[PDB]
Each structure stands twice: as C-alpha cells, then as structure tokens.
Amino acid sequence: RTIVVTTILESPYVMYKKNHEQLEGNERYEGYCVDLAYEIAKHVRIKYKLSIVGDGKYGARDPETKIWNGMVGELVYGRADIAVAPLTITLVREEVIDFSKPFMSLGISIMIKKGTPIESAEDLAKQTEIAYGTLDSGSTKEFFRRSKIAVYEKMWSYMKSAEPSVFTKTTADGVARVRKSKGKFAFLLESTMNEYIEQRKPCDTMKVGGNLDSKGYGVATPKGSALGTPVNLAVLKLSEQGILDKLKNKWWYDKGEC
Amino acid sequence: RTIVVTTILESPYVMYKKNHEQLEGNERYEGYCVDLAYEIAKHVRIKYKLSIVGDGKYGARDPETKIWNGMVGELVYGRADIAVAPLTITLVREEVIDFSKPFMSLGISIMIKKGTPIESAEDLAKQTEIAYGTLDSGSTKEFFRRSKIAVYEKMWSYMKSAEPSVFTKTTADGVARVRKSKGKFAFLLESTMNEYIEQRKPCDTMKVGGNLDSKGYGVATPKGSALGTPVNLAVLKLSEQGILDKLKNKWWYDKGEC
Ligand SMILES: NC(=O)CN1CCCC1=O
Ligand SMILES: NC(=O)CN1CCCC1=O
Ligand SMILES: N[C@@H](CCC(=O)O)C(=O)O
Ligand SMILES: N[C@@H](CCC(=O)O)C(=O)O
Ligand SMILES: [Zn+2]
Ligand SMILES: [Zn+2]
C-alpha cells in the first residue's frame, strides 16, 4: 500500500533540506521532483516513500552481465514501483520499462566557464586545448557513443580515449571541474541542469549555443504496471493546469541569483 | 494489410504536390508528415494509404452527441488505423486513443502582422483595438476555454463572445486574416505553424513573445491497438537518429524565404 518511489539527488530536482539530518522519511528532501511526486501521488491517490537510488545512477545496461543499474534497474528488478526524477525517455529504456508522456522538454547542451572561446559543438570538436566530458552512465554519454553525425562522432572519439577520464560520476563533479579549470574544461549536460546552474552563484558558467537534440523526461514504471496509466493521465493534467510550469519557475528562476 | 493513415492538409505537414491533380494515392502529397509516415511505415514494416480527414478537423468531442470528430474520430470509430499529423497530445484525447511519445515539441504562440504593437498575451488581454482568435475545434481553443490563469481567462471571455467570430475553420484562414487586417487581428496558434509561416513570403508576420505552454505532437492509434508499441519505438528511433531534426530542417528552414 505504500509504494516505493526511486529518485536521485540532483539539483534542483531532489536536494536535502537544510535541516535534513534532523528529519526523517520524505521530509528530508525538497525540490522539483519532490513536489512532482507529491502532486502525482495526490491525483493517483497513493501513499509513497521517496528512496534515493543506492548507486546514484540514472540507468544503463552493463553490456557484459546485461544487468540494469541505477533507477531503471530499481524498476526492472521490482525494488521500486515508480521513479520520479529527471529520467530521459530513450528507446533502450522504453524496451524494458514504461514512461509517462514527458513532464519537461530539454536537450543536450554545452556548459562553459564564462569567457571560454567556445560557441558550439563544432567549436569543441575542432580543437584540443579545451577538454570536454559528460556524466557517466547516462543518456548524454549514450548519445555521443551512438551518434552517426560527423561532429558528434568526432567528439565521442576524443572523449572515449581522453586521459584523465572526462566522464564524471555526478553532474556536480562536472560543474566543479568546469569552475576550477579556468576555461580549459567544458561539460556536456542537459539544458535543464545547465540552465539551473547558470542561475546560481558564483554565476561563473553559461549555456552556449543551441541544444544538440530535443527530448523529454518521463515518470517511469515497471513494464506493464497498473500505475502507468493513472500516472500518465496525472502528468497530462498537471501539464494542462500549468503546475509543471509553476514548479519549473519555482525551482529555477524565482530564486535566480545571476 | 494496407493500413489507413488519417492525416490533415496543414502546411508544411501535409500539402498537395504541384502536379497532384495528375497523380494518385500517396504520391499526391508531400510534407513533414508524409515523410514521417514513410519512415515509420518502413520501421514498422507496413503498407499504408494516406487519407485526408473528411471534415478537415483535428478532433474534439461534441458535448451534446458525445461524438468525436476529426482525426481523433477516425481512430475512435475504427475508420483509420493510425494518424500521422500535427496532433497535440492532450488529456482528453489520451482517454480515448493512444499516442506515441512526442515527435515534435511546441507551445501556443502569438502571430502578429509585423509592426503590430503587441509583445505578449498580457498586451492582447488588456486592450480591444486588436482582435485576436484561434483555430476552431482544436487544442488551442480548448486551452483558452479550460484555463484558470487570469490573463487567459480574460482572453477567453473576449474570444467566446467576439462578433464577428474569431474562431477560424483552418489555420490558413487565420493567417490570411492577420495578413489582411493591417495589424488589427492577431492569431493564436502553435509555435511550429507560427515559425513556418514566418519563413514564407510575403514575410509580413512574426512570432512574438514566449510560448504559452509546453507540449508535443504524437502519432496516434486506436486505444489498445497492436500498432501502438511498434510505432512508439519507431518514433524514438527516428528521434535518436536525428531524422526528426533533419525533417524539421527540410520543411521549415532549408527553404526559408525571409
Ligand atoms: N538541426 C536542429 O536544429 C536540431 N534541433 C534544433 C532545436 C532542437 C533540435 O533537436
Ligand atoms: N512560466 C513559463 O515560463 C512557462 N513556459 C515557459 C516556456 C514554456 C512554458 O510552458
Ligand atoms: N537525464 C539523464 C542523466 C543526465 C545526462 O546524462 O546528461 C538520464 O536519464 O540518463
Ligand atoms: N495541433 C492542434 C491543432 C492546432 C491548434 O489548435 O492550434 C490539435 O491537435 O488540435
Ligand atoms: Zn552531517
Ligand atoms: Zn484543379
């Protein structure tokens, strides 16, 4: 009767509240997906408990063991009933889990430290003075790995072999690396995260250029699960009532520091 | 074995080829959705015949007879197997048909004749010198009808009662009205259509302001139909291989005249 909602610590989607160590259960957390989970659970009429995914990953299949990790894995192996997180709707995932229609629309983007001489993916691909990378084990990495587009192929060949590794284990590590590298590292990440960081002190990074693709995040359920339909309709209702727009404003812009 | 694909004449999604009267069947048509249909049918491995929806409408339920019209109706009553068209994914439709994940992301937008003193929905709502309207029987009209947001409520109250009618029967009639009204009519339509028109001679209209919402178009099938899964995966594959981006470029920008 209490359903398990797997999610991930990723600002501003899910973050610890300032006094979290003095709190328990759902009250430990705040952010866009915490609010999204509350609203969906209210429409679908369920009790639920937030659970930060143990391995801190979004979800990918190990090509050897064929085992899924991350939140995708929580759903696949029946350890979580729903995932409410910035989880990208992709073909390979759609084969093994279900997704609501998108609750946010976004694309892969470039983050630079301000002043960096880079305006586009082409600009990065044609030089080597500025290193660039992505989050490990997520959809952005897979994008470069799978792309058959020339410039992206070129970027992948550079990233796959770059030493020291340019694949970070969290988005926050990528951001720090941009910020500490004096313009010699750029980060490839989703425009939503990029746009949030750009609005936060020290206000030293910015998104450059257009997005590389157009896609969306979806609330996910195990394949064939009974919750999938209600959740989907809940997402569409929140979209049409403007709640999703409201929440984006709340967590990105209303508190903008730059 | 030959499946019926309902669609709608709406530039640049489906248009008559220049010498259509000398042609037959699928060869009569060209445009983004014609290409989209071809690509999906190739992945799903089906033969199909394009069929322009008889009533020229997207789809709405008559509140009296409770009968669905337009392409939604073609699917609901089993006269078409698939719809490939700029058909907006909405809650009420999702109750009676299925939709792939979105193949295009868009939002409601304002089109003005260039020079018109209007920058926003607020600007329209607070004056009456400039009339404004929408397409009849589509999702934009429903948006205003259903909105609980102040400015939009105000716009709806004006449109619902405006005389002569501001609800056009096709998008093209709305555009003509903007173009012939010397700045005294603005049109509320999806940003995709708005963006296409803006790139076409006489180059006398433009999109102003941000979009009013964020949503998407989806390929639609009757509820519970076996084609739904394959079509969905086909859409995600085309998205990830960049075909959808390619097609948008082909039909909007590559041939831009402004
Ligand atoms: N070739 C393109 O412009 C591709 N784009 C543009 C915006 C979003 C996207 O996927
Ligand atoms: N309040 C908002 O900004 C709402 N927006 C912005 C862009 C798209 C959308 O639905
Ligand atoms: N949203 C991504 C994670 C972030 C990224 O890969 O840039 C995913 O679902 O895998
Ligand atoms: N795409 C819309 C039609 C255009 C509009 O309403 O602006 C629909 O599916 O109803
Ligand atoms: Zn501590
Ligand atoms: Zn003729």
Helix or strand or coil: residue B244?
helix
Instruction: Say what angle helices A150-161 and A139-146 make with each other, to 10 degrees.
Output: 120
Q: Do B95 and A213 touch (CB under 8 A)?
A: no
How distant, in Å, are the alpha carbons of A5, A183, A244, B24, B207 from that of A44?
13, 47, 16, 49, 38
Q: How was this structure determined?
A: X-ray
Contacts of B63 (CB under 8 A, 6+ apart): none
Segment 111-140 of chain A within 8 Å of chain B by CB: none
Q: Which residue in A42, A2, A34 sits closest to A15, CA to CA? A: A34
CA neighbor of A95 nearest in space, from B250, B70, B68, B232: B232
Residue B197 phi, psi (nearest 5): -60, -45
B153 and chain A in contact, CB less than 8 A: no
- On whether the CB atoms of residues A4 and A81 are closer than 8 A, the answer is yes
- For an interface test with B, the pick among A44, A94, A106, A142 (most B C-beta atoms closer than 10 Å) comes out as A94
Which residue segments constitute the domains of chain A, with CATH numbers given?
1-106+216-255 (3.40.190.10), 107-215 (3.40.190.10)
Q: What is the CA radius of gyration of chain A?
A: 18
Q: Taking CA B248 as the corner, what is the angle to CA B245 and CA B252, rounded to the nearest 5 degrees?
A: 145
Nearest neighbour of B94 by CB, restricted to A149, A236, A242:
A236
Closest partner CB to A91 (pick from B149, B213, B236) = B236
Residue B149 in contact with partner chain A when CB distance is under 8 A? yes
Q: Which residue of chain B has the CA closest to A231?
A: B91
What are the CA-CA distances from residue A166 to residues A112, A150, A155, A171, B110 (Å)?
15, 20, 12, 12, 43
Q: What is the resolution of this structure in A?
A: 2.0
Interface of A with B in 190-219 (CB under 8 A): 213-216, 218
C-alpha distance from B101 to closest chain A C-alpha (Å): 6
Hey, is the C-beta of B249 within 8 angstroms of any chain A C-beta? no
- In order, the DSSP letters of B27-75 are GGEESHHHHHHHHHHHHHT-EEEEEE-TT-----B-TTT--B-HHHHHH
Cβ–ligand 3 contact at A193 (below 6 Å): no
Atom of ligand 3 nearest to the CA of A58: 10
Identify the nearest ligand to the CA of A16 by its number: 5
B9/B31 Cα distance (integer angstroms): 10
Q: Give the A:B interface size as CB pairs under 8 Å.
A: 72
Tokens found for residue B130: 């400039």
- Please tell me the distance between residue A29's alpha carbon and the centre of ligand 5 in angstroms: 15
Distance of alpha carbon A182 from alpha carbon A112, whole angstroms: 10
Measured distance CA(B210)–CA(B16) in Å, rounded: 31
Q: Which residue has the tokens 């005389």?
A: B163
Q: Which two tokens stand for residue A99?
A: 């997704």
Residues facing residue B205 across a β-bridge: B113
From residue A41, alpha-carbon distances to A29, A203, B250 in Å are 16, 35, 42
User: Can you spell out the DSSP letters for A157-226?
Assistant: HHHHH-SS--EESSHHHHHHHHHHTTTSEEEEEEHHHHHHHHTSTT--EEEES--S--EEE--EEETT-T
Q: Which ligand sits closest to the CA of B210?
A: 2
CB B140 within 8 A of CB B134: yes
Residue pair B90/A233 in contact (Cβ under 8 Å)? The answer is no
Q: How near does any CA of chain B get to the CA of A203, in Å?
A: 24
Interface check for B79 against chain A (CB to CB < 8 A): the answer is no
Which residue, A221, A25, B251, A163, is CA-closest to B243?
B251
Ligand having the closest approach to the CA of A174: 3
Which of B234, B217, B246 lies closest to B42 in space, CA to CA?
B234
A183 φ/ψ angles, rounded to the nearest 5 degrees:
90, 0
Token digits for A238? Answer: 């929140």
- Per-residue tokens: B102: 């979105």
Contacts of B97 in chain A (CB under 8 A): none
Round to whole Å and give the CA distance between B72 and B61: 9
Q: What spacing in Å lies between the alpha carbon of A25 and ligand 3's midpoint?
A: 26
Half-sphere exposure in the Cβ direction for B189 (13 Å, CA):
29
Q: How does strand A185-190 pair with strand A131-135?
A: parallel
- Segment (H or E) for B2: strand B2-7
- The answer to whether residues A190 and A86 touch, using CB atoms and an 8 Å cutoff, is yes
User: What are the tokens at A142?
Assistant: 């897979």
Put residue B139 in one of left, alpha, beta given phi > 0 → left and psi -120 to 50 → alpha: alpha
A110 beta partners: A188, A208
Q: Is B240 on the interface with A (CB under 8 A)?
A: yes
Interface check A163 vs B, CB under 8 A: no
Q: Is the CB of A210 under 6 A from ligand 1?
A: yes
Using the Cβ of B99 and the Cβ atoms of chain A, whether some distance falls under 8 Å is answered with yes
User: Which tokens sit at B164?
Assistant: 């002569």
Q: Which residues of B198-232 are buried (b: 16+ CB within 10 A; e: fewer)?
A: bbbeeeebbbbeebbbbbbbbbbbbeebebbebbb
Rounded distance between C-alpha atoms, residue B78 and residue A250, angstroms: 44
